[PDB]
Symmetry: C3
Subunit: 145 residues, 3 copies
């Protein structure tokens, strides 16, 4: 159509308007094709996971420096550590994303991970570096869509 | 096109991102094809109606158990009763949606409706059950889009 | 397709749902094809400009009476003057939009603009009328998308 193309413009325009409003007001962060957001709650790993999937997203996990920095700023903003979408329950010391694939990008705080098999989750410090941790602490719920 | 299909993916993806953010942050509830939301205001029936249409939606009305429960949770959350998008002004005892069609799904509190012709509106209790009421009370404004 | 048309309906519907939620909750104002929004911050001209572009929009500028009134209501709501997307730095007394084009619609407060070359920005009073001003004051950041 010709009508299809102007309908698409309008749709794309309106999308960027809503994204713009949410962005301007700090409701979320856009990094490439990824949108990060938090409900401000501090809960444990399993709770965060459910909150995120209930909203149609997933517990956030950084796969690039820019994505890592985005999540870091939210952690900084809320002054709380953040549980990341990765665990090493399956095999010890081998952290994997929740789809089962092995993590590639890492930003471990020097010396980490250590403490080992008692600590199967990953938390992000407010400077963006990571620490392996037990999964029952109260951490800021950050989701990716 | 081939380009059309990847443009559509992207558009659909971005939509679900904005919906995800609004959902995660409690700005609205998605139930099937219906989105519920409130501005937190307690006003009378006529005012709610205007607020909702000004936003491009309508005063909420539940047509299923799940929809009813969704509105109920908002009522619970704000600890206030909710005016529903239905009245019986036309014929007495015959409640109709605002398009004029007769209500099908009901969730009357036992004994309701009673009091009759002096009470042409419907309010939802915080447990989700309904009570027929005068239309001039201050009730939580919940809209559907 | 036939499938394309029902996919488009759904997409358009969901867009209006998110816009409806943002609108109902006062997160933004829709005027024709333009969406206005604020982050509530009072900062100077250069800062507002950056905030708006970071969100994928621009510092707001009214080109119609309705658009002017929309921005005015936000100014009223936040009880603060608003920097508008226009300056007269290039040539003195000749105010232009930030794309360089000359402003057409104006709503100067009677007597304005005056003070002249020391005042290259434009602020909106809470009644919607304009005043030319220095660019270093703290004003409400209102963006258009
Ligand atoms: Ca272990
Ligand atoms: Ca471990
Ligand atoms: Ca550790
Ligand atoms: Ca009656
Ligand atoms: Ca009645
Ligand atoms: Ca009654
Ligand atoms: Ca000058
Ligand atoms: Ca000047
Ligand atoms: Ca002046």
């Amino acid at each position: 159509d010709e009508e299809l193309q102007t309908e698409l413009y309008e749709i794309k325009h309106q999308i960027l308007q809503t994204m713009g409003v949410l962005s301007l007001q700090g409701s979320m962060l856009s990094v490439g094709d990824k949108v990060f957001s938090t409900n401000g709650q501090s809960v444990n790993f399993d709770t965060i996971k459910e909150m995120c999937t209930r909203a149609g997203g997933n517990i956030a996990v950084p796969r690039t420096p820019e994505e890592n920095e985005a999540i870091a700023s939210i952690a900084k903003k809320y002054n709380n550590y953040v549980y990341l979408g990765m665990i090493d329950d399956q095999t010890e010391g081998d952290f994997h994303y929740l789809d089962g694939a092995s993590v590639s990008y890492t930003n471990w705080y020097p010396g980490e991970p250590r403490g080992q098999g008692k600590e199967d989750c990953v938390e992000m410090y407010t400077d963006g570096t990571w620490n392996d941790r037990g999964c029952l602490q109260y951490r800021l719920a950050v989701c990716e869509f």
